[PDB]
Design a protein around this nucleic acid. Structure first.
Ligand SMILES: [Mg+2]
Ligand SMILES: [Mg+2]
Ligand SMILES: [Mg+2]
Ligand SMILES: [Mg+2]
Ligand SMILES: [Mg+2]
Ligand SMILES: [Mg+2]
Ligand SMILES: [Mg+2]
Ligand SMILES: [Mg+2]
Ligand SMILES: [Mg+2]
Ligand SMILES: [Mg+2]
Ligand SMILES: [Mg+2]
Ligand SMILES: [Mg+2]
Ligand SMILES: [Mg+2]
Ligand SMILES: [Mg+2]
Ligand SMILES: [Mg+2]
Ligand SMILES: [Mg+2]
Ligand SMILES: [Mg+2]
Ligand SMILES: [Mg+2]
Ligand SMILES: [Mg+2]
Ligand SMILES: [Mg+2]
Ligand SMILES: [Zn+2]
Lengths: 111, 73
RNA sequence: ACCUUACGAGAAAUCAAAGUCUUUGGGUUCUGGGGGGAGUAUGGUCGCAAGGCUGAAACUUAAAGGAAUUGACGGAAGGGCACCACCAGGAGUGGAGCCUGCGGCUUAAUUUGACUCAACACGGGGAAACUCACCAGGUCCAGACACAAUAAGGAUUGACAGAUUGAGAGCUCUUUCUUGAUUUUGUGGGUGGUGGUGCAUGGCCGUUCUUAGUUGGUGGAGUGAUUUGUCUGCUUAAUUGCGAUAACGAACGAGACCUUAACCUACUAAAUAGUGGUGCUAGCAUUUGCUGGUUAUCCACUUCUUAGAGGGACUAUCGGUUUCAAGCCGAUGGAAGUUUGAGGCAAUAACAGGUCUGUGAUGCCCUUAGACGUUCUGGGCCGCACGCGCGCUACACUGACGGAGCCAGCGAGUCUAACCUUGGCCGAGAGGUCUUGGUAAUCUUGUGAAACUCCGUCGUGCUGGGGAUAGAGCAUUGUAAUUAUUGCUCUUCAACGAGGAAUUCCUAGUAAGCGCAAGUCAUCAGCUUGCGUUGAUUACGUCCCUGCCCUUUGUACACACCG
């Protein structure tokens, strides 16, 4: 179970995702159930950005002890979008000005 | 739940599955003659004189058409 | 004696000795060798005594203990928030009558879940049948498949009439036709279950908490668990930020984002939106005007209506006050200056919170043909001595009744069906009937809503306030309305004269008043989700009460004080 869950989170981050997150909830070896979380990268949680960049999915695996729910959250990288917003809402980038020397001598070029 | 006493009067009368009868198709039998037919058939639009008629007390059935065909003598 | 370093020491707290101790030797005396049993027995010895001093063992036990750390708690000390807390208030509820939900009682059954916030107009739970799970009865198999048995000189199915049955269930029987290998009887093995367990689970939802909280990298402190960063103060809705500063720089949550409402005589456009004209007319005036009607009069227009793209607010400008910083408070301008208003989304860690009765989501347990399956008929969920919780109508002239005026916004609506219904006619009404428009910016529909406004009757009287509880009829939905479905008429016309202790919600188009649409819906709203209409008073604070968070502190707690 961990092999798969570490395997799938490794695969998604190698595929160029910004963050991946898988949850397995269910009875493992005992009557008292327990949730495992397996994460890598970072993910946002709130706002309109989650709708556009997080893809989420839920499954019910039917074992012989009971149902095992499987959640997967994948944060795609905003830079590789090509359709819509290319960055998070509060990303600001100031472009570096190319620095040049002061002239100190007035001249006219002619034609 | 509380209990199941199965209170009701016992009426277990699961039916007879139409008890296998003895040798059938008794049309008539004729010593060195052609046989007429007991249990009159029916002048229907489908039944081709193959279905007989039950002989009840004062009525004649059909069986396959479940409709009385009795007429006055 | 104290303060500071840490050469050094130490398990650390801490220590100028507790240092000069694995690089181990200045001199000397005393005591200890896991926790109990036990400072107990026994024997001495001192003492008037009380007792003192010496002082075991059998046996028993896997820890007892020390110093720190992080939590949890404290009938410990401080700080900070919030109309699910208070302040100043507003409107109430608690009293009454009814409506509805829960407990109780009763019952054949009154099916069940959920009991502080975080159960109780909640399960979209407004149940006549169905739903439906409960009760009294009656059918059916819709018991796959396999193997045996039975058996084409019939394995099995169906029924006319009568008895029966609530019954036109031949269900069962009397009676005898019809069918043809599909079935039937067992053995397995399945299937179905609104049967059980939410304390065996998934998913979803609620709650902590929508408070402001959480975490790495690198550096610093510590042997370490850990700590600082993440803080004395000020500030903010906010660990929001300024400042201090062994910390710098970021991440998640907050914020940004998205939706919506407000501005645009700026752009692009429009009989499914709307003006103005010009035709054609009507009425009144008469001058050179006023108000309408008209769909083939047509020409132009976009202000208002609609939605595409954009613009616009960033607390702008000025003044004041504050390490003169983040900010805060006035004034001006502005459509807009409480986060511009309102939401949607919403961290880490949790909870034995709710849901197996939403699910063909589910493990196991039970049941499976006189069934806990499915269906049909009739009841029940509504039964009423009582106790609670959301509500509706009121207790009256700041009003009731009559006539007249008269204005919204959100929205829904039928075809292979019969939904929204205009108009004409009949009827007091509720309703009936004949046509029509609409699959919709086109028609219902300007949804002519109610409060309200103007004139009138009432005249402080449980009164023309209130309309509960009863009796007769007329209609509508529906297979069916009796424990009245709902609507209408007439009559009967109760409590209640502002409500004890208690207690809820709320800071501007907000509270409160007033209606309408939608959801459920064949019929039924006193419910909910929204929308407009009319529109206040009070405050712009604080920790007093109640909650929650943080700091300091103590701890023998850590399934954590229900220890
Ligand atoms: Mg869970
Ligand atoms: Mg200690
Ligand atoms: Mg009351
Ligand atoms: Mg209910
Ligand atoms: Mg209920
Ligand atoms: Mg049943
Ligand atoms: Mg079943
Ligand atoms: Mg059932
Ligand atoms: Mg559970
Ligand atoms: Mg470090
Ligand atoms: Mg270190
Ligand atoms: Mg660090
Ligand atoms: Mg000032
Ligand atoms: Mg009256
Ligand atoms: Mg309307
Ligand atoms: Mg009466
Ligand atoms: Mg009080
Ligand atoms: Mg109201
Ligand atoms: Mg103490
Ligand atoms: Mg302990
Ligand atoms: Zn025939």
């Amino acid at each position: 179970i961990r092999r798969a869950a570490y395997g799938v989170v490794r695969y998604v981050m190698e595929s160029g995702a910004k963050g991946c997150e898988v949850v397995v909830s269910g009875k493992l070896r005992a009557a008292r159930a327990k949730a495992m979380k397996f994460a890598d990268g970072f993910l946002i949680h709130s706002g309109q950005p989650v709708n556009d960049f997080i893809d989420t999915a839920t499954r019910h695996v039917l074992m012989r002890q009971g149902v095992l729910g499987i959640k997967v959250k994948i944060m795609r990288d905003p830079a590789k979008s090509r359709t819509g917003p290319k960055a998070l809402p509060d990303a600001v980038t100031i472009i570096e000005p190319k620095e040049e020397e002061p002239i100190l001598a007035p001249s006219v070029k002619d034609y | 739940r509380k209990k199941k006493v199965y209170t009701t009067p016992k009426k277990i009368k699961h039916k007879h599955k139409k008890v296998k009868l003895a040798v059938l198709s008794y049309y008539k039998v004729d010593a060195e003659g052609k046989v007429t037919k007991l249990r009159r058939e029916c002048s229907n639009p489908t039944c081709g004189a193959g279905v007989f008629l039950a002989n009840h007390k004062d009525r004649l059935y059909c069986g396959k058409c479940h409709s009385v065909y009795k007429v006055n003598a």
